[PDB]
Design a protein around this motif. Sequence first.
Motif, mmCIF file in Angstrom:
data_model
loop_
_atom_site.group_PDB
_atom_site.id
_atom_site.type_symbol
_atom_site.label_atom_id
_atom_site.label_comp_id
_atom_site.label_asym_id
_atom_site.label_seq_id
_atom_site.Cartn_x
_atom_site.Cartn_y
_atom_site.Cartn_z
ATOM 1 N N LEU A 257 0.822 -1.203 0.000
ATOM 2 C CA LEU A 257 0.000 0.000 0.000
ATOM 3 C C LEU A 257 0.857 1.255 0.000
ATOM 4 O O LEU A 257 0.520 2.238 -0.663
ATOM 5 C CB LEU A 257 -0.937 -0.007 1.204
ATOM 6 N N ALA A 258 1.958 1.253 0.749
ATOM 7 C CA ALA A 258 2.824 2.425 0.778
ATOM 8 C C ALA A 258 3.428 2.683 -0.593
ATOM 9 O O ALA A 258 3.459 3.825 -1.067
ATOM 10 C CB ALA A 258 3.921 2.238 1.823
ATOM 11 N N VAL A 259 3.911 1.630 -1.252
ATOM 12 C CA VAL A 259 4.483 1.816 -2.578
ATOM 13 C C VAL A 259 3.417 2.295 -3.551
ATOM 14 O O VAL A 259 3.679 3.152 -4.403
ATOM 15 C CB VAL A 259 5.145 0.517 -3.060
ATOM 16 N N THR A 260 2.203 1.755 -3.447
ATOM 17 C CA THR A 260 1.125 2.187 -4.325
ATOM 18 C C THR A 260 0.768 3.649 -4.093
ATOM 19 O O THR A 260 0.508 4.389 -5.046
ATOM 20 C CB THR A 260 -0.094 1.298 -4.110
ATOM 21 N N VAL A 261 0.738 4.080 -2.835
ATOM 22 C CA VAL A 261 0.461 5.478 -2.535
ATOM 23 C C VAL A 261 1.553 6.367 -3.108
ATOM 24 O O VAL A 261 1.280 7.453 -3.632
ATOM 25 C CB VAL A 261 0.310 5.671 -1.017
ATOM 26 N N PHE A 262 2.806 5.932 -2.996
ATOM 27 C CA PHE A 262 3.898 6.704 -3.574
ATOM 28 C C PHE A 262 3.731 6.824 -5.078
ATOM 29 O O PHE A 262 3.918 7.903 -5.648
ATOM 30 C CB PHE A 262 5.233 6.053 -3.226
ATOM 31 N N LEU A 263 3.359 5.728 -5.737
ATOM 32 C CA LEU A 263 3.116 5.779 -7.175
ATOM 33 C C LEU A 263 1.984 6.744 -7.505
ATOM 34 O O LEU A 263 2.083 7.532 -8.452
ATOM 35 C CB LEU A 263 2.795 4.379 -7.694
ATOM 36 N N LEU A 264 0.905 6.702 -6.725
ATOM 37 C CA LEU A 264 -0.245 7.554 -7.004
ATOM 38 C C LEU A 264 0.108 9.027 -6.859
ATOM 39 O O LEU A 264 -0.218 9.838 -7.731
ATOM 40 C CB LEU A 264 -1.401 7.193 -6.076
ATOM 41 N N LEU A 265 0.770 9.397 -5.764
ATOM 42 C CA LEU A 265 1.143 10.794 -5.582
ATOM 43 C C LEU A 265 2.273 11.228 -6.500
ATOM 44 O O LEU A 265 2.434 12.430 -6.731
ATOM 45 C CB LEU A 265 1.526 11.071 -4.128
ATOM 46 N N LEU A 266 3.055 10.294 -7.030
ATOM 47 C CA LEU A 266 4.055 10.659 -8.019
ATOM 48 C C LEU A 266 3.437 10.838 -9.396
ATOM 49 O O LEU A 266 4.000 11.546 -10.236
ATOM 50 C CB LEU A 266 5.148 9.594 -8.060
ATOM 51 N N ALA A 267 2.292 10.207 -9.645
ATOM 52 C CA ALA A 267 1.617 10.341 -10.930
ATOM 53 C C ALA A 267 1.255 11.793 -11.210
ATOM 54 O O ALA A 267 1.085 12.187 -12.367
ATOM 55 C CB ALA A 267 0.362 9.470 -10.966
ATOM 56 N N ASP A 268 1.136 12.599 -10.158
ATOM 57 C CA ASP A 268 0.779 14.001 -10.310
ATOM 58 C C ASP A 268 1.924 14.856 -10.836
ATOM 59 O O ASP A 268 1.675 15.885 -11.473
ATOM 60 C CB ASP A 268 0.311 14.565 -8.968
ATOM 61 N N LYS A 269 3.168 14.461 -10.578
ATOM 62 C CA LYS A 269 4.334 15.239 -10.970
ATOM 63 C C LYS A 269 5.013 14.724 -12.229
ATOM 64 O O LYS A 269 6.017 15.307 -12.648
ATOM 65 C CB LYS A 269 5.346 15.264 -9.822
ATOM 66 N N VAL A 270 4.498 13.665 -12.842
ATOM 67 C CA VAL A 270 5.098 13.102 -14.048
ATOM 68 C C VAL A 270 4.272 13.546 -15.246
ATOM 69 O O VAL A 270 3.071 13.806 -15.099
ATOM 70 C CB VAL A 270 5.176 11.570 -13.977
ATOM 71 N N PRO A 271 4.849 13.640 -16.442
ATOM 72 C CA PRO A 271 4.044 13.988 -17.615
ATOM 73 C C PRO A 271 3.020 12.908 -17.915
ATOM 74 O O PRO A 271 3.170 11.747 -17.532
ATOM 75 C CB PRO A 271 5.080 14.096 -18.737
ATOM 76 N N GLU A 272 1.965 13.305 -18.622
ATOM 77 C CA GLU A 272 0.865 12.411 -18.957
ATOM 78 C C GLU A 272 1.037 11.793 -20.341
ATOM 79 O O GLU A 272 0.123 11.149 -20.858
ATOM 80 C CB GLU A 272 -0.466 13.152 -18.861
ATOM 81 N N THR A 273 2.201 11.974 -20.952
ATOM 82 C CA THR A 273 2.474 11.375 -22.246
ATOM 83 C C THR A 273 2.646 9.872 -22.102
ATOM 84 O O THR A 273 2.881 9.353 -21.009
ATOM 85 C CB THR A 273 3.723 11.980 -22.883
ATOM 86 N N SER A 274 2.532 9.177 -23.224
ATOM 87 C CA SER A 274 2.480 7.725 -23.258
ATOM 88 C C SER A 274 3.497 7.161 -24.236
ATOM 89 O O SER A 274 3.314 6.077 -24.791
ATOM 90 C CB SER A 274 1.075 7.259 -23.621
ATOM 91 N N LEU A 275 4.581 7.894 -24.472
ATOM 92 C CA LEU A 275 5.643 7.419 -25.345
ATOM 93 C C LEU A 275 6.686 6.594 -24.610
ATOM 94 O O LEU A 275 7.521 5.960 -25.261
ATOM 95 C CB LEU A 275 6.330 8.598 -26.039
ATOM 96 N N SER A 276 6.658 6.578 -23.283
ATOM 97 C CA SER A 276 7.603 5.801 -22.494
ATOM 98 C C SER A 276 7.194 5.921 -21.036
ATOM 99 O O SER A 276 6.409 6.793 -20.662
ATOM 100 C CB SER A 276 9.041 6.279 -22.699
#
Lengths: 406, 388, 387, 425, 409
Positions: A257-276
């Motif tokens: 759950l902690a790793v998943t939460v980190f992924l979720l809150l990091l999704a906000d600071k990463v670009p939304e592109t889908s090339l990589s």
Amino acid sequence: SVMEDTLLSVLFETYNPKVRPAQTVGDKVTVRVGLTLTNLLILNEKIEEMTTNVFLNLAWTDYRLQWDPAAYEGIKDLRIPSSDVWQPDIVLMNNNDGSFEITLHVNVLVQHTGAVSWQPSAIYRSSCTIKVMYFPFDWQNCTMVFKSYTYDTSEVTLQHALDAKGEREVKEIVINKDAFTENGQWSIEHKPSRKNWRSDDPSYEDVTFYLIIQRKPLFYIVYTIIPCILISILAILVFYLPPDAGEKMSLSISALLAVTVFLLLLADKVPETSLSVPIIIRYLMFIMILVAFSVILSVVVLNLHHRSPNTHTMPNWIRQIFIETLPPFLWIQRPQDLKEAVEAIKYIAEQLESASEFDDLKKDWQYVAMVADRLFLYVFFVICSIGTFSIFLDASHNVPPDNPFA
Amino acid sequence: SEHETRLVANLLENYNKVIRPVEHHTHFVDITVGLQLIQLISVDEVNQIVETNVRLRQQWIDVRLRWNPADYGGIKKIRLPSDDVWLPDLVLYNNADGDFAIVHMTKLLLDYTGKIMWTPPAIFKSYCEIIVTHFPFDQQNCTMKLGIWTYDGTKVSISPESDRPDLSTFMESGEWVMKDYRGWKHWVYYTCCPDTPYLDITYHFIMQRIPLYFVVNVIIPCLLFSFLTGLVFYLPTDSGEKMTLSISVLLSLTVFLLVIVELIPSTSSAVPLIGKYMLFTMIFVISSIIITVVVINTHHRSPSTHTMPQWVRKIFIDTIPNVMFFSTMKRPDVKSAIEGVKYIAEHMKSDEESSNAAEEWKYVAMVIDHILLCVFMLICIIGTVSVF
Amino acid sequence: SEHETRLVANLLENYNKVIRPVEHHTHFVDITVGLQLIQLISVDEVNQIVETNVRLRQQWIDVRLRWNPADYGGIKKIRLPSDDVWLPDLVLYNNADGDFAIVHMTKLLLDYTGKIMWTPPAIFKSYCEIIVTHFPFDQQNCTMKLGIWTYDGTKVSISPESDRPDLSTFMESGEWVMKDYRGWKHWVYYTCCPDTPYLDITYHFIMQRIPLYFVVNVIIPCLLFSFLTGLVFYLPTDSGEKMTLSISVLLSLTVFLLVIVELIPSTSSAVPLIGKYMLFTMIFVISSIIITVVVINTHHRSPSTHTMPQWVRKIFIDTIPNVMFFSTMKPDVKSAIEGVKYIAEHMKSDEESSNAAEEWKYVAMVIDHILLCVFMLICIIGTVSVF
Amino acid sequence: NEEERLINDLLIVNKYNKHVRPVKHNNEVVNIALSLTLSNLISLKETDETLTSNVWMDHAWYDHRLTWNASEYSDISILRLPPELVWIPDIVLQNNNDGQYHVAYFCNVLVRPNGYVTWLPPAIFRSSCPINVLYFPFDWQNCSLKFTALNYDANEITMDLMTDTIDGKDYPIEWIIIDPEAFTENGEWEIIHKPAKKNIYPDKFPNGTNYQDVTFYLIIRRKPLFYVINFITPCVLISFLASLAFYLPAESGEKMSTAISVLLAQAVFLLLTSQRLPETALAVPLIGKYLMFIMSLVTGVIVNCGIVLNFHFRTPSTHVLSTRVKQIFLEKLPRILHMSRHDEIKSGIDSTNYIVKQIKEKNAYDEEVGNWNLVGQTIDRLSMFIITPVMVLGTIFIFVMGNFNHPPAKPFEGDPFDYSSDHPR
Amino acid sequence: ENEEGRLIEKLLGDYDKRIIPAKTLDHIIDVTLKLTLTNLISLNEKEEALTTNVWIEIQWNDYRLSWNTSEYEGIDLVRIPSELLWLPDVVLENNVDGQFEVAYYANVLVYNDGSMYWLPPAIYRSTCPIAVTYFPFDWQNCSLVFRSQTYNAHEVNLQLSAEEGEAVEWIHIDPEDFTENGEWTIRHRPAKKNYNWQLTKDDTDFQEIIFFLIIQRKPLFYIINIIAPCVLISSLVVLVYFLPAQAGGQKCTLSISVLLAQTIFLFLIAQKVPETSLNVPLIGKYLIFVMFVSMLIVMNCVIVLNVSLRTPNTHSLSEKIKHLFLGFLPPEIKSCVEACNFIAKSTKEQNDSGSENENWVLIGKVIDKACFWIALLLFSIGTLAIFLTGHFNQVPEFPFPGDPRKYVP
Ligand SMILES: *[C@@H]1O[C@H](CO)[C@@H](O[C@@H]2O[C@H](CO)[C@@H](O)[C@H](O)[C@H]2NC(C)=O)[C@H](O)[C@H]1NC(C)=O
């Protein structure tokens, strides 16, 4: 002064700033184009836009704006409002918003030879294509494409600006140390400038300023990678907890759950592109999947530890693998009433013996669980350690090329 | 240029930009409208707005702006501020969040023949009916409807340059793939004005989302937690942790539901299959929690107050265990001392009987739980094979 | 109208909107300023900015714009664009995120006597010092400081139209209640301008927050999770769930404290009572977790290594329990002979060790009952106090 | 009204040119006196590294064209003209964040008969303020508003700080003016220093517009009570629960859950602190350093709890309690850590002897399991004594190093002047 | 030659656009007004703003802009930019932003008789005070209030348009150009002239044209994505009464985790409804109710665990409690001899203690059964009642309850 008034009146008597200065029909106006960067404000990766505070150094020659200084009290140059003279429609073509033109319309400097220089300021927002593959250990290649919106190569000829001494061209962004603030998140590695054409369009010419900037990833390290390294340490540790603790699920699931939460809150600071998939997201997903397999194998080990002869019979292959072959490798090897009374004693003794045999088999199951748990501990330590090391070594081996190629 | 200075002075000396560029009020201005897509800035799915950076190329004849090049040094083209000449009031009908018309009055190119070439930039923020039903694997079809606002077809006629918009200098989105794009001209007959035709060009862009971002960032974690959902059935009851695992899976899934409901518009015109599958997997997790609670209850049945029904004994202990072939289940004062030993023996006998009954209840719980595990893994196999 | 067209041509013929409307330059143009609040759009507590929809009613006499109605077909009033005549430069001093002056240059009304009525709209985004002490039951006092910018009191004088803003058309907020509102004129001497007084009218609105959104969304969940604190005290150690319950309460309380943090400005001017109370409740829950860890340790004291001290025995076994009124607490045969004797001896020793362990368990039970009664007493006194 | 006649004479009759510097001869230089009045420090958004200020930017120059004989007209000692009719110096905030270079409201200029023009427009300036998060939330920032003159080079107009007269001698106003009658205190930021400097860059020439600027600095100390009360205190207490976790018995079944919950709470605090600061790499904030340290320490606590549990649940059937382990964890450490302390009858005889032997070996097994329990208790007591002091001392040291962080009592290290409104030079 | 050039130069020449086109002193300009809704872009709940893409038809007569068609080659209609003409400053007063005016100043269609026809497009953001009481089963009643920003009722007469003699008293929805929102269904769309009788015939605010949009939320999205998950997760609390009341039963674990999930759902709702404090949203009331019920069930779990884990050491199992909860609701030889006797006696007492523990466990089970039935009934009735109240939230049959009219084309 009154002489400045007379000079301005004679200069702009019939001067039409609508008309490009071409002394003879067919002439082209040469436009020095240079860029001074005063602040790289933002590189907003979510919307793929770079915000910069720049001075756009432009110089051209307007033959109509010529005079003899001796006839006008020795006035060698003038500061004229930019709207009163013809200017080339030099714009930022790749602006992310709709703002093509400068923000500050500073006065143009007109010298008696007709050399018009113009250094307007602008807070520009240019569209920068973000390569996410190595975010946050990434270097972006953000360009500011400048050209005349109106005039083509048949009308103006774009050139590079000149340095302070008008001797040689400056093929780069100018950074004035006196007026320049480092971003603190990006370090400018290369800042070349280059003219670009289009082989499919002979009328196209621009001056592109490239900003090869390298992210300084301390923030992301401290706030995402170290916590996830700690969580992966816990995920490894789950295989050292005894199944009797009744806490293997707590530990492994909390790590997941902690790793998943980190992924979720990091999704906000990463670009939304889908090339990589950014190296950080790939690392977080690696750790997520490793912790999920940690949960799976902790469930398996709990299942093994809680089997009994009353419910399961131990197969020969599990006994072979987890009792003999493996443990050595993991260093984890291990008167009627008297007849009635004698019958009662016999029953008690045989019941105790039956319990002893059942306990021995249950202990065999528990030992298999222990051996499998140790095997998983070693395997998961190795996988997590070398996978994390490989990912971060790959990230570390990502630096902008020595030659900016532009 | 002195020639061009004189030319611009002459062209606009008695030129009125309020008037259409026709030699007779019965004639119509023929405008060749061509949309050039430079960049697809954004697709705001929640707000259903598509931001595009476009150039609106417009061409028409303004015979009032003709000259003879021989009388002006052979000048055949000039750049003239668009604010000086008549411009078509071309409006984006489906504007949602921006400007209806062109606001960047860039200079226009004028031939000596009166031919004008005006390509102002624009940021079209148009309404986009977002079809969130195959999200994130969806393709969106939303358009930009352009037309002359206050003139009908008999006064100003707009025609497309080409059957498709111009994407020659289009920057790749990185989130969307431009599958198709076409420009259709339409003649409408509104109720206001039932006599004359009103013209508009609708440029539509068929956009395919690139699903890698959302796949990795949303779908993979939900798939992991959904898979762990059925792992509770392999967790022994004696561990005292089945609730931990199942409830943590449920909590993670509700967190992902919170994440998902903010990624798509709240429209009900179509049920997003992502939301439907989140609801389905959450119903699955709830059923898993209910059944694991039943299994825990069965495992802890006290034989004192509960006697195993005969049908339970025949189903879960006699037939189903013989079906799972891949499972490793089985299928003086001395009188007082003598009486005390007797009591010990008989009480331990009754304890053994009660323990056997309890072990039968635990075996039933294990068998139920293993059946559910096999059902879940069969669901997983059929699902994973199906997607292929 | 031909008459009105000719009138407007005549008035604005020689009119210079740069000059003040005074016959003699030593006079001052008196402006009646009224503020009409159309809507309290937003109160940004975190940023301390209050966005309001207002009309800035301004009235003054422009002697140059007089006419005789009989000469213009009886026209007594006309509407002129604001940009055509001299206007006062009313500047919102405490502007924070908008325009200092009026930017909606709407048409103004002009009587035949030169009496001008100009009521332009405005979205004032003024700075609002937020007092967070009684959040979310707080009332806010923040104002709009309006004054003539470049003209001192001897050249342009502003007087309030009324003692109070005009809220007759105020659209009800749904987040705030206008408890009171008033407007005060001040003669201010600035460091720039020490010789002469600059006039301003400071309108202020005492607005009370409607505390139902925040009640339902923060306080009630906080009260529920804080009330779950005594349960861990009533919860037996044998259940192995005391830490789970208490820690869940603690984590939820932390989450809600952080949520509150997101709702108030980071200013340290004062400590919110809601934040202070929840910090105290977190401290209490953490003390309860400390005492619960002590109780759990006591419950599991192995009698082998831990011997109950007499100060523990006399107090927790013999002193408090009687005080707990409402609780219902309290050849080869010789080897066999030696073996039976050994079994009996070891059973006796096990009985004694058990008895000691249950003594420890009793001590833990009485400790946690004392804590439960303390928590219940705190709850009763709190509910009485709030009522 | 003779203001009409005066303004006509000054502007129309004299052919006043708004676009010509107010100099008699071209080689002359217009002196623009410049001061800044701060009325409200609206915000300092650390995430966007932006300072929003409500200021009155005061300009004073001389325009010889706007002179008049006050007596020729009814005595007119002052005159208000719109800046769109007169020449104004375009002093621009160079380091703005948005595109707002100039002032917001272009108010009237004030002109005296000697040609002295004063212009005091209000402005909302959003300037770039690089943030030093090193000591957050006990930090002080150093924000500057750099004003340049890009419309004329230094040979044409000279920016200067406005001067003021106290007792006949004129002293430069070398600070941001703060008016007690018009200044609103920021509830989060306290102004420590507020100097103003006229900077000249000798490496540049007076020919250019980058030769000289006027910069107003604003050293502001954050008031940390908010962050201390709402961030640091909860984190510290939740952390101390980690040390408390060592006191739970291994048979409680909640040691790891307690430690893990503390770690997750610390992670939550770390992420919420992460969201409140810019994503720079100059330094890890003080609170960030403390959270990293405490999260590492609590992970160590979780590992040590796992080790204690592993030891507690050992049995003779899986592990052997070595004599070294006994000597260390049951004899030596306990004391250092001050821890407390006829075919029938033979068959019946055989059955009872067997029962005795089984019970006896069971007692030995339980005794060894109890020894393992005591080893675990020793380990967790040792770890408590070794980690609670580390936790407490690290917390105290980190949050005392924060409070021992103040602005240097003088801006411009190499300058002994205080730049204080109450002591001009 | 384009005769429109000469015609417009004649019209606009000597034309003052500051002057209201009143022929005489008592003339009142009739400003007809019609609204065409092409797109209900959004109803932003948090900021209580309705965004609409509307064409507003404004018609008046300007006697100055009249000519003789025979004198201009039969031209009867010209297009003049609205920036050159007098306009009735018709604005949207209840706008959230400062956008009073239309988005794009389109040309005005001027007819030879002086008839002026202006159909500018606009993106209006208007204040819609949102009633949350029945969210997400709510219907909102949004209003676009139009009035002259400059002219009072003594000089401008705002009116609704009329084709074929009948007043258009509704927002016009043109099928050729209209998009269904997908979240909001337009049920009623009446339009009416309104007067502020607190103001006099002057004051510029006396008269107004109000266009109403009574829109109903489509709740399928909210049902499927919030209410169904919410109800399903909240139905998990009752399961705790079937878990064993002992260590490893994870009773409080399940109940507390369900409470946490409900709190997460409260946070979810926080982002979907406005921050107004006039009413509690229906889903908000349900969340508060189920959180309270889950706290009661956590209390119940703690009480049951306390009762079940009682021992003779701690609590005396009263006979009356047993009656209530289990009767209504549901030398070598001598030394060896003494050793054997002691063993038997100790075993017997230990077994009796175990029996009394078992009896406490049985009492706990009975309490679980009764409390399960109570909690299931409470939760089921609360869910049914609240969401049936949501279901029975009806849009009123008539646009105005007093008026019998339907206000439809
Ligand atoms: C402004 O002044 C500087 C310094 O007087 C000028 O710098 C000179 O530039 C010329 C032209 O290349 C060189 O030949 C001289 O050697 C430079 N002098 C020095 C001292 O470096 C500069 O050219 C002037 N610029 C303008 C626009 O007047």
